[PDB]
Scaffold this active site. Structure first.
Site, PDB file in Angstrom:
ATOM      1  CB  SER A 101      68.906  37.513  44.764  1.00 38.46           C
ATOM      2  OG  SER A 101      69.091  36.180  44.263  1.00 38.46           O
ATOM      3  CB  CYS A 117      72.710  46.457  35.454  1.00 36.56           C
ATOM      4  SG  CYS A 117      72.076  48.059  35.351  1.00 36.56           S
ATOM      5  CG  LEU A 121      71.448  54.436  33.599  1.00 36.66           C
ATOM      6  CD1 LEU A 121      72.105  55.140  32.390  1.00 36.66           C
ATOM      7  CD2 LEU A 121      70.893  55.418  34.625  1.00 36.66           C
ATOM      8  N   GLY A 122      68.668  50.521  33.580  1.00 37.84           N
ATOM      9  CA  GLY A 122      67.606  49.658  33.079  1.00 37.84           C
ATOM     10  C   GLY A 122      67.308  48.502  33.990  1.00 37.84           C
ATOM     11  NE  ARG A 123      71.418  44.999  32.322  1.00 33.86           N
ATOM     12  CZ  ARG A 123      72.671  44.768  32.021  1.00 33.86           C
ATOM     13  NH1 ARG A 123      73.088  43.551  31.848  1.00 33.86           N
ATOM     14  NH2 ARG A 123      73.499  45.766  31.814  1.00 33.86           N
ATOM     15  CD  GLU A 192      45.679  39.159  40.890  1.00 33.86           C
ATOM     16  OE1 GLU A 192      45.468  40.365  41.153  1.00 33.86           O
ATOM     17  OE2 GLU A 192      45.560  38.682  39.737  1.00 33.86           O
TER      18      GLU A 192
END
Length: 206
Positions: A101, A117, A121-123, A192
């Site tokens: 997205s 989020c 701070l994380g996601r 890759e």
């Protein structure tokens, strides 16, 4: 106005954010429709990527429908790719879709993408670092340090490394990611990287 802790969310201080790359802003949740006006007017935002679960929006008492309505009024596209808070397994599972997205919105080029989020701070930093790693010609440690240097936070690096393993995988019976040392998939070979980019783009609108 008083001292607060540095790596923790302070919702009472209002929406906060950091510009990480010209195309990409990482921040906390918009709290009211006026915060969307601010993003459009001050940051040229054209896309919002919301990584929260319904449980999070409920806890925080946010009127998401009014947020989304204001986005539509202003021509901004609002996108949801939920993941669980403080949950590296969730983030790992949702990273490919969330990055698809993000990268789609960047490719459209109509303005900056605001990735958030609850706290950013994380996601939200995790998705942003995965995007930089897979699409912006850096290794994982560079991608990671580049965000964290600008916005102090604690994204799970292992989640991003594990999503990289997941997207580069061609054998469903490969030894599991959990058996590999910290260094596996912290860089990727050019073939890759190409494989990962195609697989991520293939998730656009799934």
């Amino acid at each position: 106005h008083m001292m607060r802790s540095p790596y923790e969310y302070h919702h009472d201080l209002g929406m906060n954010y950091t510009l990480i790359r010209d195309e990409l802003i990482v921040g906390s949740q918009p709290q009211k429709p006026e915060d969307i006006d601010h993003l459009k007017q001050e940051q040229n935002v054209a896309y919002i990527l919301n990584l929260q679960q319904d449980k999070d929006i409920e806890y925080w008492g946010i009127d998401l429908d009014s947020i989304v309505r204001r986005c539509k009024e202003l021509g901004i596209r609002h996108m949801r790719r939920p993941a669980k808070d403080f949950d590296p397994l969730s983030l790992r599972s949702q990273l490919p879709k969330a990055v698809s997205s993000l990268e789609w919105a960047v490719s459209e080029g109509k303005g900056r993408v605001y990735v958030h989020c609850s706290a950013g701070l994380g996601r939200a930093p995790g998705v942003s670092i995965a995007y930089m790693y897979w699409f912006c010609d850096m290794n994982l440690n560079t991608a990671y340090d580049t965000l964290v240097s600008k916005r102090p936070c604690g994204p799970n690096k292992g989640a991003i490394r594990g999503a990289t393993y997941d997207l580069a995988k061609n054998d469903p019976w490969k030894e599991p990611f959990e058996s590999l040392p910290e260094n596996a998939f912290e860089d990727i070979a050019d073939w890759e990287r190409k494989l990962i980019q195609e697989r991520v783009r293939a998730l656009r609108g799934t």
